[PDB]
Every structure is written in C-alpha cells, then in structure tokens.
Amino acid sequence: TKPHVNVGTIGHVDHGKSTLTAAITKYLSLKGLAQYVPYDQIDKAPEEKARGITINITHVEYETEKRHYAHIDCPGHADYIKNMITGAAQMDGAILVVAATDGPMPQTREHVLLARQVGVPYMIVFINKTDMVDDPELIELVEMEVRDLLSQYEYPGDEVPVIKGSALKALEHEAYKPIQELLDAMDNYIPDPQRDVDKPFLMPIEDVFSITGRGTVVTGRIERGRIRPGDEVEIIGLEIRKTVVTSVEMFRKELDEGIAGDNVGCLLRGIDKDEVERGQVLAAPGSIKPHKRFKAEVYVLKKEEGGRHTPFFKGYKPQFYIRTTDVTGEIVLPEGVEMVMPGDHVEMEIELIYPVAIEKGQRFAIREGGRTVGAGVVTEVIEL
Ligand SMILES: Nc1nc2c(ncn2[C@@H]2O[C@H](COP(=O)(O)OP(=O)(O)O)[C@@H](O)[C@H]2O)c(=O)[nH]1
Ligand SMILES: [Mg+2]
C-alpha cells in the first residue's frame, strides 16, 4: 500500500497552477493512476469552511506507482493565505509554479514566505510557460532568482528540484516529460511523512479529577505519539514537573497503549489534584517547553468570517486559544507595522500572562469576546 502525501500548487496568479494540476491528473490517467480532472473543473474551485472562514480550494487525488498524493489548488491569493494559516488543507510539500515569462511576482514571494511561516517542510519549483521563452539564458535567470527567493526564506534553494516545462503543452506527448520529471521529484525529494505515532507523545489536558485512594486522573485526546503504563512524562505549562503515567484508560478499559486520536484518562503518579489543571499538557520529557513569549504568523479574520472590523494593534490583549485553554496575551507588531486590518496577515509578537506549552508550527485561535478574531501559526518560541 502507498503512503499518502499532501501537496499543492502555490505561486502568483495566472502563472499556471491550475493548468499544471490538470496536466498531472491527465498524464496519470493514461496509466490508470488518476481520475482526469479537466482544467475548467479545477479552475472553478468549490467552497469549504474552516470554522467561520470560507476558502475556495480544489482537492484532487492522483497516484504515482509509489505514492498517493492529495493535491490542493486555489483560485485566489486570499484563498492561499487563509488555507495555509488556518491549516484547512496542510502540505507536506509545495509545488511553486513560476511563469518563465514575467518571472517571480509579489505572490511568488508571499507564498514562499507563508510556506516557511506555516512550516511546509519541502519545496519543489516548476518553471512554467517555457513554450513562450526563446532565450534559454532568461529561463536560467528565473530559476536562479527563484532559488535565491527560497534561500532568502531559509529553504535550501540550491538543493530543491527545479523542473522547467509547459503545463499547457502537456495538457494538449513529448510535453509530458516535465510532468514525469515533476512527479519523480515529488516521489524522491519529499520523504515519506513520519506518522504521528513515532512523534514524541503529547496530550493536552482537558479535565482533572481525583480518585480517592488511587490518585489524580487527567483526561484528554492524544495529539501524537504513544503513552503506555509506566512511561515517564512531563507536565508542561502554567513550572515543569515529571511523573509516571500509572494507567491509561479509555472506554472503561485499561489500555496497553494510547495513540493519537484516543481520548484517554491518565493516572499520574504522585501528582496532587490541585497541582495539575486543564490547559497543561502531558508530553514526552524534553519534547516541548513552556513559553510566555512567542512569534506567530497571524491572519486577522474579516467581520463576515466571524471576526471584527477593528484591526490588530500594539497593546491589543485578546484571548489565545492554545489547545484546551485560552490565555490572555498582548500583541506587539513588527517594525514599521502599526495595525493589521482584517483580511491581512503579519508575524506578531505575543506575550501571554502565564507560560503555556507551545512549539513551532503549532496552530491556535485568537478570540475577543465571543468572536474568533484571528488565526495563527507559531513561528518562533522565546526562552522562559
Ligand atoms: N503559453 C502558456 N500558457 C499557459 C501555460 N500554462 C497556463 N497558461 C495559461 O494560463 C492562463 C492562466 O494560467 P492558470 O492555470 O489558469 O492560472 P493559475 O492557476 O492562477 O496560475 C491560461 O491562458 C492558461 O492556459 C503554459 O504553459 N504556456
Ligand atoms: Mg488557478
């Protein structure tokens, strides 16, 4: 059975993302490896909802002989902003489409920035529209500039695969080679995703209660990794404490192990009922640390998406929903940024009133009153 990998086409509008997506499904349909989805159906993307946010996004699926790919493609720049920050459809690798004619453009830069900010681990470049460029040295110019763009945002720009071709020619036989070259790069450059159960154990604590004569139980849904009776864990958030999970219980049965997705109850050895609380996390020791201060790429929701008309500003103190708890925090904006209007995104500095377990790449909501006013992805954690 083939591993499932999430990918998507990013880049500036009209550079050929939707055309490349169609060409991939057509090329693979000829080998019985994909449903052919024509360009018109990919381009007219349907709507879907990430909580109150509506995003236009096309999902298609196709297989190489080795892999099953889940592929996303969006019409508008705003769709990519919302999809990448809210994590509606996450990506193991991004296919950066850059037209060789006009070359890299504002959304080329911004989508690379967003990919880095949201933690997309690998980039593959497809230089499109080469059928329109007669001077081959100018195609190399575009490649070099895209490589420098990736390096500017800490991607290994010298090492990423860069495929040149014409998505349109492929969509209309020798023009299939860039498609095959692209798929081989996806097969070889993007590694098989490590699955949640080999990741370090983490479970946010939802509820705490005491069994008299036995000890303190914390309940929560395991986010990643495994927990087994006898394992050592740390309680992170709000001074770090070590303990042993004596027992893992789910559906009135003691488990040999709890895995990601299991809502379990963990009996904590020697933990007083008043010293652990909702919002802390159980974690494999050393795998995550408490922080009061961190940076995060934050999208400010529009009023129509459930947010407010008011922008974010220096000193704004909303609530930060970090896993199972919400904590007051104070906003600081980067240099030269005085406000963030709804619909915009920026990297903000956040200082919570008390430390919580938080890590790079973690997503969180920002709420003010009853409205969700922002969505963020942690980009940096600051030492306590
Ligand atoms: N000449 C040429 N035109 C292309 C190529 N790929 C796409 N186009 C034209 O792209 C216009 C926009 O590209 P499209 O895929 O719809 O947009 P995108 O998904 O927003 O980048 C249409 O004319 C596409 O057919 C190509 O490889 N060569
Ligand atoms: Mg498109």
Side-chain angles (χ1 to χ4, degrees):
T1 179
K2 304 175 183 171
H4 280 47
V5 171
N6 285 334
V7 297
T9 40
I10 63 174
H12 197 89
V13 66
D14 283 330
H15 282 205
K17 296 169 314 268
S18 289
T19 300
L20 182 62
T21 301
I24 295 168
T25 76
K26 183 166 177 171
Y27 172 74
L28 289 174
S29 69
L30 298 180
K31 303 172 176 47
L33 287 176
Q35 170 71 51
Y36 170 40
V37 186
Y39 166 85
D40 288 330
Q41 294 182 38
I42 285 167
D43 171 61
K44 283 152 202 153
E47 295 180 353
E48 93 186 39
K49 293 195 65 192
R51 278 199 46 103
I53 310 184
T54 297
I55 319 170
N56 297 92
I57 169 170
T58 280
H59 298 80
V60 300
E61 284 159 7
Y62 50 81
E63 299 175 359
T64 57
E65 74 311 335
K66 274 190 221 133
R67 287 222 176 120
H68 183 99
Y69 288 103
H71 181 116
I72 59 174
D73 178 65
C74 301
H77 174 46
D79 298 306
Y80 283 102
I81 296 166
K82 293 181 287 190
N83 173 66
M84 296 185 77
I85 284 161
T86 66
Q90 298 179 46
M91 277 180 292
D92 300 307
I95 299 163
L96 173 62
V97 185
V98 189
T101 40
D102 42 339
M105 278 301 166
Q107 299 149 26
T108 313
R109 304 191 300 274
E110 193 177 340
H111 291 189
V112 170
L113 174 150
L114 274 178
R116 167 58 48 178
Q117 292 300 84
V118 311
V120 175
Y122 299 95
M123 297 269 319
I124 290 171
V125 180
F126 189 96
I127 297 176
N128 197 34
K129 308 196 174 183
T130 61
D131 57 296
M132 305 286 298
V133 183
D134 299 325
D135 311 284
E137 79 277 7
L138 297 182
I139 298 174
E140 316 173 315
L141 168 59
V142 169
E143 161 165 350
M144 190 229 61
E145 299 215 327
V146 173
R147 288 195 183 273
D148 288 339
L149 172 59
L150 293 169
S151 287
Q152 179 182 345
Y153 292 95
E154 293 307 317
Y155 284 106
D158 292 349
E159 311 167 10
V160 301
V162 177
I163 294 94
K164 311 162 203 47
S166 170
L168 188 52
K169 293 297 188 181
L171 200 52
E172 299 164 336
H173 302 327
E174 164 93 358
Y176 276 136
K177 233 153 288 175
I179 310 301
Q180 180 61 57
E181 189 176 346
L182 171 62
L183 293 162
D184 293 345
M186 298 167 52
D187 285 336
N188 297 324
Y189 187 66
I190 308 170
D192 284 357
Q194 169 190 50
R195 147 93 185 253
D196 284 9
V197 50
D198 249 7
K199 309 184 174 184
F201 168 71
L202 189 140
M203 184 206 88
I205 297 171
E206 290 156 20
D207 196 45
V208 180
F209 69 97
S210 170
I211 301 176
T212 298
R214 207 178 157 208
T216 299
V217 179
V218 296
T219 65
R221 187 169 313 281
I222 298 163
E223 173 178 320
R224 57 168 188 246
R226 333 182 201 214
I227 184 67
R228 289 193 249 216
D231 284 355
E232 293 189 25
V233 300
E234 286 174 339
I235 306 173
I236 310 287
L238 291 54
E239 206 265 359
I240 302 185
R241 314 162 62 100
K242 300 210 62 174
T243 177
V244 172
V245 175
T246 309
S247 171
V248 189
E249 186 167 304
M250 176 178 66
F251 299 144
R252 308 187 187 193
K253 322 171 203 115
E254 285 193 352
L255 308 183
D256 292 327
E257 68 176 16
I259 60 181
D262 293 337
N263 182 42
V264 300
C266 293
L267 191 59
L268 303 188
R269 169 195 289 177
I271 293 303
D272 174 79
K273 58 194 181 304
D274 295 318
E275 310 275 28
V276 67
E277 60 181 88
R278 158 187 183 80
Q280 295 173 306
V281 315
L282 300 183
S287 60
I288 188 170
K289 299 215 286 179
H291 303 277
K292 283 185 57 176
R293 294 170 81 220
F294 63 95
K295 291 180 176 188
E297 193 71 25
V298 169
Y299 166 81
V300 180
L301 273 72
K302 293 188 176 182
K303 167 69 180 282
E304 41 269 56
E305 306 169 331
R308 300 185 176 276
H309 293 111
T310 76
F312 281 38
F313 53 96
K314 176 186 176 181
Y316 184 38
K317 291 183 180 58
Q319 296 300 105
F320 290 83
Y321 281 69
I322 300 163
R323 297 194 167 103
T324 59
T325 189
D326 71 284
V327 186
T328 304
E330 180 179 5
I331 296 314
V332 166
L333 300 184
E335 202 35 79
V337 177
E338 285 187 295
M339 62 157 184
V340 189
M341 288 299 288
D344 283 345
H345 69 96
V346 83
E347 184 179 62
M348 325 200 311
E349 289 185 53
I350 299 152
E351 172 171 2
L352 309 173
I353 51 176
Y354 53 78
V356 314
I358 198 162
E359 65 195 345
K360 220 178 191 183
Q362 183 180 340
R363 287 180 165 81
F364 61 95
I366 305 176
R367 296 204 168 92
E368 170 58 59
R371 318 272 292 176
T372 301
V373 294
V377 187
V378 178
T379 52
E380 176 188 339
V381 291
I382 280 84
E383 275 317 325
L384 204 52

